[PDB]
């Protein structure tokens, strides 16, 4: 244990229940702005992860249409919220800076 | 931010091409001259001077 | 002038593994991987795996993505390829010497350690579909592959190309067991031209040592007989007959070659009529219209094909094959002379001397030779086998033909076309 | 000589037109 | 520890000697068993008028049918009794003769090869019944939309000239070529100072030259008063042909400028620019990640089922351009990415394609050349076009001193702003007009 740790651990606890995105049900990579690089990523994801993305991704956009919010119960809690769309991404911009270094030459 | 254009290529392909802007920055300098008769330079021309 | 020329080296380590290597004096360097994985070892549940793995090559691997593979092979005019038989894969690499230590490099990644990415796998589907219609043109390789549907019943009867109803659903599960269970150092033989023994040595010693773990015995191939037809109104009717003939490597396999060269294999004069070859004048006598005729061998490690091709118009199919059929038969009831066995002798001998005159073609007969029988046999003793065959060997090659059950395969109009109890 | 006389052989390479 | 260069320095020496007649022998000795032996002669359709068009691919069929000595299939069962093979072609510069056979099959094959190029007797039959072969043929390759198109490329590009002539002729002339004529262009064109005797493999030279002056001795090689061809240089014409025919599936194009010659050292680094441009094939495993621009594009957007750029080498002219093959919706986008990348060489190459180029040529060269019959080919060609054979270390040495300034000179001189040669055959309604083609020629921003 570090105490600078812990006050990280603390700031970015506070900062993803002030972010708001889990009242609407949502995760972080749900929100990730969508470009060329994030578009290859999701279009290798699995069938299953890819249709719990649309399906969260419909529902957060039902409940603003209505200006309302989940229940206190069903919000994503912030020590069960594990990224999904690590790895795919990291290895498509890996890919792609392989790609430019090669073009320098 | 830009540092993917910093390699062998692309200064290759930049003195490829410098001698294709000058001459069109030679075309657009002259070009304004001309179309605004610009007194400070067309008095230095020859045969353009007897125009004033 | 030349140098003296140096003779191969060739060296079976203790892990199944073999290695073989000639140090010429060429300017390029070639090497190949030999592989008995061919499309036999296939079954019922996993059809066409062998025609896609030979499709992904070029794929991402465990230390080169698929992007490095492309541009570093073809950055130093390089060459990739992958051949495959019913038996043998044989991934094959040329370049110029200075670079065939990058090239190797890149061999053993794409033989040992590939990923088969599921979206990679995915999109290279389709192309099984362009790859098959490609080959499919030519009517010869619809015509062999039934042929060998309706010889055997299971292992050699699987086609190289993969079934249509199988197009996209290849999974990367059955990509990983197969090559995790066919590509390993028991079944494996390492060859190149233009290499020292030494790095090649020191690469399987590195490298190679870690694909232990033998398996899959498969099952042998039990001929069954049989007759496939297939009316398409082709411009032509295409036409293969033969029964079991013998096993590569015995001593009826030679009669079977002389028995090849004496019926006639193919022609050696542009344009030309064919005039020692007994199978075409016997057809040519009562047949005026145009057709091709040619004896076909198909010898495999365990069995082995021999018979007759033929092309003739829908009308004469059946004057054609019954021609062909009754030529086979006099030559079996013992008309047959000795300058006529010495002239196919003297044919065979040239085919093969011809044959290995190539690179390509050397290295295909080694890696063969390496992986049939573990060792190399020089030409000089395959010519003395060949002198060796007697005409009564030859004699009992045709009786052979003539008894055996037989295998026939058909394409085009068929409504002249016999059966085969009408033969 | 276009009757077949030995058996297939598939050819794939990376930047060669394949071959039967 | 030997290198690529101590290796080029390795290959044997081509022995070159001349008879009192003129003929040229040439041989490579190798270790080999087996060998390849054959005479390549300076005749072709250049050298045929309108009147006997089509004369030298008559003659080409009946050579193996029948001589004075050897009359019917007796030849045929000699050639096929010793397992060798027997082979020939013609095209519109070069004819040649050749066999394969063991080694020690040489002084047959040899004695063949002359009883072949002197005493052939024509048998009245035997024209007779060639002719409709050589009919029939002329309705089979009606078929193949890649000679078609090529064919046309020739009969617009050299228009009006030699040149423009197809190698087996027109229908008409096929029908009517008597027997003296074929003996006038026989007695006229085998001459001894335009044969090459050309080997390969397994033989001393001592042998072969031996060999000749027992059978070749014999050939006239005194021309007729004042008679000897001269080929007079070809006007190339910008011109399209288009042969719209929608009943065809897919579209054939190619497209091509006038090129130098044979022995025009800039040959050398137009074949290091088309190795930038590369070919393709639908078959191809490489796909997006492809070197050549055109060839990802192509694979990437399905934009043709293949292309290939060639350079086609004549007396003092030439084709050097592209040939590609794609659906009727498609042929706009090939042709602009195609002078896309032929105005980016001119006016941008870069060092790193150049040295690609340069080691795609060394491995052709290199990988070509290997075998007897290839080896064979090169010795008769290149004593025809060059007289001499050029060593492998010459080939190096020329690749090596081209960069990217001698491929930007080169390509400006040859592409940049010159007129094309079109042809096009099947639905190409799409096939753009000779106008926007001329016009995609030059960069307004250049």
């Not at chain 5, 290199?366 to 290839?374: A, F, I, K, W």
Request: one cysteine or more; glycine letters at 8%; a neutral charge.
């Amino acid at each position: 244990v570090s105490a600078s740790s812990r006050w990280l651990e603390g700031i970015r606890k506070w900062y993803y229940n002030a972010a708001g995105f889990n009242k609407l049900g949502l995760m972080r990579d749900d929100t990730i702005h969508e470009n060329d690089d994030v578009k290859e990523a999701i279009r290798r994801l699995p069938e299953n992860l890819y249709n719990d993305r649309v399906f969260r991704i419909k529902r957060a956009l039902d409940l603003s249409m209505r200006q309302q919010i989940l229940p206190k119960e069903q919000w994503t809690k912030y020590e069960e919220d594990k990224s999904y769309l690590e790895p795919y991404l990291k290895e498509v911009i890996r890919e792609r800076k392989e790609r430019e270094e090669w073009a320098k030459k | 931010m830009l540092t993917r254009f910093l390699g062998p290529r692309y200064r290759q392909l930049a003195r490829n091409w410098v001698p294709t802007a000058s001459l069109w920055g030679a075309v657009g300098a002259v070009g304004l001259v001309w179309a605004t008769d610009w007194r400070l330079i067309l008095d230095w021309v020859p045969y353009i001077n007897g125009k004033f | 002038v030349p140098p003296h020329p140096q003779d191969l080296e060739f060296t079976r380590l203790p892990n199944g593994l073999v290695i073989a290597s000639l140090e010429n004096y060429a300017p390029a360097s070639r090497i190949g991987l030999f592989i008995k994985a061919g499309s036999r070892y296939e079954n019922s549940n996993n059809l066409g795996t062998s025609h896609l793995l030979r499709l992904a090559s070029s794929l991402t691997t465990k230390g080169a993505s698929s992007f490095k593979i492309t541009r570093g092979i073809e950055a130093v005019g390089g060459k990739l390829s992958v051949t495959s038989t019913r038996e043998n894969m044989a991934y094959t690499v040329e370049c110029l010497r200075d670079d065939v230590d990058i090239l190797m490099e890149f061999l053993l990644n794409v033989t040992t350690a590939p990923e088969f990415r599921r979206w990679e796998v995915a999109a290279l589907q389709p192309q099984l579909r362009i790859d098959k219609a490609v080959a499919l043109q030519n009517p010869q390789a619809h015509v062999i592959e039934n042929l060998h549907a309706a010889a055997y019943r299971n292992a050699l009867a699987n086609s190289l190309y993969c079934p249509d109803y199988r197009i996209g659903k290849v999974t990367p599960v059955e990509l990983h067991d197969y090559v995790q269970n066919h590509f390993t150092s028991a079944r494996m033989a390492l060859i190149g031209l233009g290499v020292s023994h030494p790095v090649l040595k020191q690469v399987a010693e590195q490298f190679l040592n870690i694909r232990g773990g033998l398996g899959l015995s498969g099952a042998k191939a039990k001929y069954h007989g049989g007759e496939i037809r297939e009316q398409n109104g082709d411009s032509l009717v295409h036409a293969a007959l033969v029964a079991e003939s013998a096993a590569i490597g015995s001593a009826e396999a030679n009669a079977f070659s002389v028995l090849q060269h004496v019926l006639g294999a193919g022609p050696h004069v542009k344009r030309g009529s064919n005039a020692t070859s007994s199978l075409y004048q016997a057809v040519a006598k009562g047949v005026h219209q145009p057709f091709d005729v040619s004896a076909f061998n198909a010898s495999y490690s365990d069995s082995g094909l021999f018979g007759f091709y033929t092309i003739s118009q829908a009308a004469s199919a059946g004057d054609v094959i019954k021609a062909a059929y009754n030529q086979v038969k006099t030559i079996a009831q013992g008309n047959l002379s000795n300058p006529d066995v010495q002239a196919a002798k003297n044919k065979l001998k040239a085919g093969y001397l011809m044959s290995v005159e190539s690179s390509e073609g050397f290295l295909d007969e080694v890696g063969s030779q390496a992986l049939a029988a573990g060792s190399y046999t020089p030409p000089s003793t395959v010519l003395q086998q060949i002198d060796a065959v007697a005409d009564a060997d030859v004699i009992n090659a045709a009786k052979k033909f003539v008894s055996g059950r037989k295998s026939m395969a058909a394409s085009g109009n068929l409504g002249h076309t016999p059966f085969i109890d009408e033969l | 000589g276009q009757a077949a006389g030995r058996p297939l052989v598939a050819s794939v390479s990376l930047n060669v037109p394949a071959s039967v | 520890t030997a290198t690529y260069a101590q290796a080029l320095q390795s290959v044997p020496e081509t022995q070159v000697s001349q008879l009192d007649n003129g003929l040229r022998v040439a041989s490579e000795q190798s270790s080999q068993p087996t060998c390849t032996v054959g005479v390549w002669i300076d005749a072709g359709s250049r050298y045929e008028s309108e009147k006997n068009n089509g004369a030298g691919y008559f003659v080409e069929h009946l050579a193996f049918k029948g001589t004075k000595n050897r009359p019917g299939n007796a030849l045929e069962k000699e050639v096929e009794s010793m397992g060798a093979h027997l082979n020939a072609y013609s095209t519109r510069e070069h004819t040649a003769y050749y066999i394969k056979a063991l080694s020690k099959d040489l002084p047959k094959a040899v004695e063949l090869l002359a009883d072949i190029v002197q005493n052939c007797s024509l048998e009245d039959s035997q024209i007779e019944k060639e002719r409709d072969v050589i009919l029939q043929e002329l309705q089979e390759n009606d078929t193949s939309m890649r000679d078609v198109v090529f064919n046309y490329l020739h009969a617009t590009a050299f228009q009006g000239t030699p040149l423009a002539q197809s190698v087996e002729g027109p229908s008409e002339n096929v029908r009517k070529l008597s027997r003296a004529d074929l003996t006038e262009y026989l007695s006229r064109h085998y001459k001894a100072p335009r044969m090459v005797l050309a080997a390969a493999g397994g033989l001393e030279h001592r042998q072969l030259l031996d060999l000749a002056q027992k059978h070749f001795s014999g050939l006239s090689g005194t021309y007729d008063e004042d008679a000897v061809p001269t080929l007079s240089p070809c006007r190339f014409t910008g011109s399209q042909i288009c042969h719209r025919e929608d009943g065809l599936p897919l579209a054939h194009v190619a497209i091509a400028v006038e090129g130098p010659g044979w022995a025009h050292p800039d040959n050398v680094a137009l074949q290091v620019a088309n190795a930038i441009i590369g070919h393709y094939d639908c078959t191809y495993g490489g796909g997006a990640h492809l070197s050549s621009p055109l060839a990802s594009i192509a694979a990437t957007n399905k934009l043709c089922q293949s292309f290939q750029t060639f350079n086609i080498c004549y007396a003092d002219t030439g084709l050097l351009g592209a040939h590609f093959v794609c659906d009727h919706m498609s042929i706009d986008d090939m042709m602009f990415v195609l002078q896309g990348q032929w105005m980016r060489l001119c006016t941008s190459a870069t060092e790193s394609e150049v040295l690609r180029g340069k080691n795609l040529l060394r491995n052709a060269l290199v990988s070509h050349l290997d075998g007897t019959t290839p080896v064979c080919e090169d010795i008769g060609r290149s004593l025809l076009t060059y007289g001499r054979r050029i060593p492998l270390a010459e080939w190096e040495s020329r690749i090596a001193e081209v960069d990217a300034r001698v491929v930007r000179e080169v390509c400006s001189k040859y592409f940049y702003d010159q007129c094309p040669a079109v042809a096009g055959f099947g639905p190409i309604e799409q096939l753009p007009d000779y106008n926007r083609i001329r016009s995609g020629m030059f960069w307004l921003r250049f």
